[PDB]
Paper text:
They are secondary metabolites that show promising treatment against Mycobacterium tuberculosis infections by inhibiting a novel drug target.
The RufO crystal structure belongs to the P43212 space group, and each asymmetric unit contains one monomer, consistent with our gel filtration results in which RufO is a monomer in solution. In the 1.89-Å structure, the majority of the residues were modeled based on clear electron densities, except for a disordered N-terminus (residues 1–10) and a region between η3 and α-helix G (residues 166–181). The structure mostly resembles the trigonal-prism fold found in CYPs and TxtE, however, several key differences are noticed. First, β2 is conserved in most CYPs, and β5 is conserved in CYPs and TxtE, but they are missing in RufO; second, two α-helices following the B helix, annotated as B′1 and B′2 in TxtE, are replaced by η2 and loops in RufO; lastly, α-helix F is conserved in TxtE and CYPs but appears as η3 and loops in RufO. Cys346 from the loop connecting α2 and helix L coordinates the heme from the proximal site, with an Fe-S bond distance of 2.3 Å. As a result, the opened active site in RufO is filled with water molecules, and the heme is largely exposed to solvent. The corresponding positions in RufO are mostly nonpolar and uncharged residues, including Thr85, Thr67/Phe69, Leu286, and Val238, that are incapable of stabilizing the amino acid moiety. A hydrophobic pocket is also shown in RufO but is composed of smaller nonpolar residues, including Ala232, Ala236, Val240, Leu383, Val238, and Leu286 (in clockwise direction), leaving a hydrophobic and spacious distal site.
Numbering used by the authors: 11 to 165, 182 to 394
Write the structure that this text describes.
Amino acid sequence: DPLFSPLDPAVLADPYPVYRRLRETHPVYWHAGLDSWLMTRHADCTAILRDPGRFSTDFRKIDIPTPPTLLSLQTLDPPDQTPLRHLALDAVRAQDLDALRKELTLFADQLLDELADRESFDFIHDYADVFTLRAITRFIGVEPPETDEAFARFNEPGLRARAHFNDLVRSWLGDPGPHGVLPDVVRLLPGSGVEADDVLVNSVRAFFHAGFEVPSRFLGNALAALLATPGAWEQLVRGDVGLDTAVEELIRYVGPVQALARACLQDTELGGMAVKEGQVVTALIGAANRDPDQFPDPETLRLDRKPNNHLGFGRGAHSCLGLNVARIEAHVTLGALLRHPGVRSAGEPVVRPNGTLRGLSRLPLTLG
Ligand code: HEM
């Protein structure tokens, strides 16, 4: 593609200048390669996410079938999605976030204390993955299987891995632990209007992944951005900016979710362009969060930025249910790293070849 090649190596290295030019010339752009419109402005992406009747997550409505193991909260829209959405909302909000912050603070400190002895380690493998996997298993209230403690099978073999995970989920539902999102789901299911069928099981799988790979990649993106921005780490070290506001700026700046796809169900004009029923639109929210029309000086990392109405947690009917867990994870991680002021890069990052959910596979670091 002449404008946007998401898996081009030079593009993966830094997509944001490519997003900017695309936004500047064709903010609503038809991409033949991806068979989708590409919206790079905050206003357009917000509209895409706030009208399920016009832009749907259920691609069956444009006659694309859903693999049965993928029909879930994520791939349904109201009214189909609604009982599940509310059940998940209810089980999440029943959790004690103060207790979660307390135990994650201890875990982050002991992780980095052990990694302080190294002179160079991969922040991704040794902290981001370990920390987020601990958080999501404790939050859901399940134990890692001894034969696959890293859940490595679950990152046809894909069909077999989904069926194995579904087997695990059903055993959890049948014998829930003493706390967490899943035991509260079990408690709340009678009278929720949700059936304990395959859609529920698939939804637990989707919840796990939403609460694992996504925050893990954010934590790596965020630290990489701080290390690569002159003065940004030292600003945190000095207490010059608050962590809450810094975390929201880091989500805006390098939040992992790059693309949210929707199916167009009614003709619509956007940026002058006539999007047609049956076509796919892609809200490039990574680009939208650097849209100058919404954020002044958007390509500059401003840890004190206020206001900051970023799209990093989505909008509307499918907005992120774990966003306050994500914020606790980031806040805890930064405070824990800040106990080791000499943190510095220790080699080059390498980017995962992923244009949809952006992250690093390696982030060489030392704590000093
Ligand atoms: C920095 C971390 C995170 C970011 C940036 C993030 C971002 C997002 C975004 C953009 C969406 C919208 C998806 C869409 O519109 O199709 C979403 C949905 C969702 N997120 Fe998060 N998320 C994060 C962490 C988490 C965590 C930790 C959990 C669970 C503990 C979680 C649970 C969910 C769920 C269940 C949904 C689906 C909601 C639905 O489809 O109705 N997320 N997330």
